[PDB]
Design a protein around this nucleic acid. Structure first.
Ligand SMILES: [Mg+2]
Ligand SMILES: [Mg+2]
Ligand SMILES: [Mg+2]
Ligand SMILES: [Mg+2]
Ligand SMILES: [Mg+2]
Ligand SMILES: [Mg+2]
Ligand SMILES: [Mg+2]
Ligand SMILES: [Mg+2]
Ligand SMILES: [Mg+2]
Ligand SMILES: [Mg+2]
Ligand SMILES: [Mg+2]
Ligand SMILES: [Zn+2]
Lengths: 220, 135, 57, 97, 99
RNA sequence: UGCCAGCCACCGCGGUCAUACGAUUAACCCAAAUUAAUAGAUCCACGGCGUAAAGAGUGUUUAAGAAAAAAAAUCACAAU
């Protein structure tokens, strides 16, 4: 019991505990197309401070800010993954649905990429089962649904006291998301990048869990 | 139960002060991790108000003097015969060659446009690129 | 009072708090001030604030 | 001290503003040919902007000109003059399909 | 350390400037009967209609010669807050990756 | 008793089963007073003016006020 509180309160005192710093760089995100947005017509008003500049009408995200955020993002994702909790990947994007689902099953993590039944999080017990435990962490690969509105699960998770980590694009509304990462949700090498980054963050977290649990078992 | 008001404040606020009154007797996981690493801004609900009047954006459009040269390169010859690739990280087309020839002709002390243009054009006719010369 | 742009000076308190009292010799007072300049600035400020206190007392 | 920053420059790639077929030309009511081109052959009607495709100024001058050529007696009201039916075709009207 | 703006500056997309009537090289990642989905690499893919000229040659992994018209397709419409994107770009198929 | 006799400050109650009427019974609240009627005290707007009551059919000036710097450029052409 005491040493359980040990095993949990240990990783919080070292910012680098999973060493995710090495997973990517400014160059990494740059060859990943991340820095590209939609047109300055389509731009969101809350996407101004994360933006860098308008190059001939096409917006450009700031990849130094992106790096700074994404750091905290994977930091958090890993940190819930070690603490043994649920993670759900949401996207409405049909291009990448298969990629994300494959990412989820391979993390041993959950994905809803499909039509989102309205009361899923709001009304769990009737929809999912008589009593149920709910995802501790949601992760958005897009903040949109195919009609270009904010995806429900933003609002819903926000209502359900759940943190959220997602990739905002030039046209998304960030304000209700826990940890945003400014970036490109539209282009394929980008989503592949993000898929694998989150994936690895997870794998590392669960590994460290197995090993520090082995340590806990050897200590006695 | 909890607080389902999405607007009122950041989930941190709602949760922390909820616990604080003793209504919620179980601390969630994410609350402790969040205490450890607070994110840049607190995720508080904001209303997407449109702008009226003389209020405009804060964005700085992106331009360099290189582009002031590329403008004339395109103005004369058109897009480069090498086509383009956005696959290759370090790729540089005919236009880039022209830009750097013009730069190294600029440190030479020639203030005149036609000199820089046509002599970087012969500087390009040396390296093996074909400038179509469109009217 | 809402209307007025410094309504705190239409308060009864603000009138009795501002302190200058005049001698028994002083009877008429003229304030001659200017509209446009940065050199008449504090004077117009004197009009817009203190004349109230003076006059009340 | 980072010299790779952006320049507060005006747009170099700025295109030339497009021009009406008469842009910086001049119209008088003494050439009935020019005025004929902008008129409907069978009717004697005056084509709108969406056909001629001229700026506001040049359209209004074309029109004032058509009227002034008509009442003084330079140009016929009820039809295009036969001589000019075979002139060059500016307008976007296809009558015959 | 490379400053980000430094990376932006020399990147092959900036050297292009306006996408208008550009010569671009691209690659096909996906096929439907008549329709080739072509990534030239900018952000969005464009789309093409397979020609009568060597129809069977354009395939999965095939590279093609694009004439880029618009970087991305967008316009604003009556009484709208923001515009409407096609999630596509406009490009023409010239020939296939002539080598 | 049965839209009858009546009752109420406002809403309203009585048309055959009325907790509103007349009379019981229980209760409630004032108390050597208690109710009714009439006057007071109190009560608008430091609010407002598209659709609700409210921006005069228009312009200028007198009185009377208010004020940092910018505050004269042209018809895309149909004032009188
Ligand atoms: Mg009767
Ligand atoms: Mg009875
Ligand atoms: Mg009563
Ligand atoms: Mg009774
Ligand atoms: Mg009052
Ligand atoms: Mg109003
Ligand atoms: Mg009245
Ligand atoms: Mg009026
Ligand atoms: Mg009047
Ligand atoms: Mg009247
Ligand atoms: Mg004023
Ligand atoms: Zn014109």
């Amino acid at each position: 019991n005491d040493l359980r509180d040990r095993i949990l309160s240990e990783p919080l005192k070292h910012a680098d505990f999973f060493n995710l710093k090495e997973l990517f760089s400014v160059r990494s995100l740059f060859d990943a197309r991340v820095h590209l947005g939609h047109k300055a017509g389509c731009r969101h008003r809350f996407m101004e401070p994360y933006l860098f500049g308008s190059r001939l009408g096409q917006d450009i995200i700031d990849l130094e800010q992106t790096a700074a955020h994404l750091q905290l993002a994977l930091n958090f994702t890993a940190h819930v993954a070690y603490r043994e909790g649920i993670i759900l990947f949401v996207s409405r994007h049909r291009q990448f649905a298969h990629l994300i689902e494959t990412t989820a099953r391979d993390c041993g993590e959950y994905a809803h990429t499909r039509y989102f039944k309205g009361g899923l999080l709001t009304n769990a017990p009737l929809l999912l089962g008589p009593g149920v435990r709910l995802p501790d962490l949601i992760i958005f690969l897009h903040t949109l649904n195919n009609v270009f509105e904010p995806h429900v699960a933003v609002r819903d998770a926000a209502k359900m006291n759940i943190p959220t980590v997602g990739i905002v694009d030039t046209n998304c509304n960030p304000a209700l998301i826990t940890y945003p990462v400014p970036g490109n949700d539209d282009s394929p090498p980008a989503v592949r990048l993000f898929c694998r980054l989150f994936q690895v963050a997870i794998s590392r977290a669960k590994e460290k869990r197995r090993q520090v649990e082995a340590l806990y078992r050897l200590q006695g | 139960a909890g607080s389902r008001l999405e607007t009122v404040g950041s989930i941190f606020s709602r949760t922390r002060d909820l616990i604080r009154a003793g209504v919620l007797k179980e601390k969630p996981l994410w609350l402790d991790i969040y205490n450890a690493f607070p994110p840049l801004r607190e995720p508080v609900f904001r209303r997407p108000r449109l702008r009226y009047g003389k209020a405009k954006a804060a964005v700085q459009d992106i331009f360099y003097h290189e582009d002031r040269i590329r403008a004339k390169f395109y103005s004369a010859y058109g897009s480069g015969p090498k086509a383009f690739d956005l696959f290759n990280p370090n790729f540089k087309s005919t236009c880039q060659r022209f830009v750097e020839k013009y730069i190294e002709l600029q440190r030479l002390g020639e203030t005149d446009e036609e000199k820089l243009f046509v002599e970087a054009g012969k500087a390009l006719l040396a390296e093996g690129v074909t400038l179509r010369r469109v009217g | 009072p809402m209307k007025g742009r410094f309504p705190i000076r239409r308060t009864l308190q603000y009138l009795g708090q501002g302190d200058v009292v005049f001698k028994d010799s002083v009877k008429v007072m003229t304030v001659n001030y200017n509209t446009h300049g940065e050199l008449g600035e504090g004077a117009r400020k004197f009009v817009f604030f203190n004349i109230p206190q003076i006059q009340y007392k | 001290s980072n010299e790779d920053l952006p320049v507060p420059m005006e747009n170099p790639y700025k295109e030339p503003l497009k021009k009406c077929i008469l842009c910086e030309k001049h119209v008088d009511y003494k050439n009935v040919q020019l005025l004929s081109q902008f008129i409907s052959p069978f009717t004697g009607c005056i084509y709108g902007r969406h056909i001629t495709g001229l700026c506001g100024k040049k359209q209004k001058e074309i029109t004032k000109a058509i009227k002034r050529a008509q009442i003084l007696g330079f140009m016929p009201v009820t039809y295009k003059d036969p001589a000019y039916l075979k002139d060059p075709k500016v307008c976007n009207i296809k009558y015959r399909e | 350390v490379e400053s980000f703006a430094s990376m932006l500056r020399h990147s092959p997309l900036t050297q292009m400037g306006p996408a208008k009537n550009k010569l671009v090289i691209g690659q096909i990642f996906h096929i439907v009967e008549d329709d080739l989905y072509i990534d030239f690499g900018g952000k969005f893919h464009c789309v093409c209609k397979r020609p009568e000229v060597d129809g069977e040659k354009y395939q999965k992994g095939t590279r093609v010669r694009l004439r880029l018209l618009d970087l991305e397709l967008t316009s604003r419409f009556l009484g709208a807050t923001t515009d409407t994107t096609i999630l596509e770009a406009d490009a023409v198929l010239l020939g296939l990756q002539e080598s």
